[PDB]
Amino acid sequence: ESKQSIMQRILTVFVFTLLIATVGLFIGQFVPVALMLPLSILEVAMIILAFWMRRRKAVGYAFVYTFAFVSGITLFPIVSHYASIAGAYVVLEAFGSTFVIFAVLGTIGAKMKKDLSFLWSFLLVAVLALAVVGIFNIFSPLNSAAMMAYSVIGTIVFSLYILYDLNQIKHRHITEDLIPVMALSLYLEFINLFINLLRFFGILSSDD
DSSP states (O other), X not given: OOHHHHHHHHHHHHXXXXXXXXXXXXXXXXXXXXXXXXXXXXXXXXXXXXXXXXOSSOOOHHHHHHHXXXXXXXXXXXXXXXXXXXXHHHHHHHHHHHHHHHHHHHHHHHTOOSOGGGGHHHHHHHHHHHHXXXXXXXXXXXXXXXXXXXXXXXXXXXXXXXXHHXXXXXXXXXXXXXXXXXXXXXXXXXHHHHHHHHHHHXXXXXXX
C-alpha cells in the first residue's frame, strides 16, 4: 500500500500496452481495409465500458491488453498514410516525440505538489472541442492550413492531459483493481498525442 508501488505497476502495464499495440500495428498491415471500421466500433464500445459506464468492478488486465492489440491494428491506416506522404522515418519521429513529452510532462505532473483537479473542466471541454472538428474531418477533409492548427492544438491539449492524468494518480486514491484502467488511460493519452504529432510532422514534412 504505497504510491511508489502502484505508480510503478501502472507504468509497467502501460509499457506492456505499447508493446502489444506495436505488435498489432505490425499485424494490422495484413488486415483488410473493410475490417478497420468494425474494429474501430469495437474500440468505441470498449471505451464506453471502461470509463463511461457506472460499473461496480473495474476492468481487468485481459480487457486492457485486448484493447491495446485491437487499437494497434486500427492505427495502421493513419500511420501508413503519413508514412507515404512524409516518409517512414516521420512515424518514428512522432513516436519518439510522444515519449519525450510523456516523460517530461509526466514526471513534472507526478512530482507536482499542486492538485490540478480543477483542470477537469478545461481539459474535458478542450477534448470535446477537438472531437467535434475531428468528426468534420472524417466526412470532409480539412486543408493544410486548418489541419495544421488542429494538430498543433491537439498536441498542446493532449500534452496537458498527460500532465493532469499523472498528477491525479499521485493525488487521488488509486486502488489495486484500478491499475488496468489507469494504464488504459495512459495508453489513450499516448495515442491521442501520437496521432496529433504524427499529423504535425506529417504536414510539416509533406509535398503539399
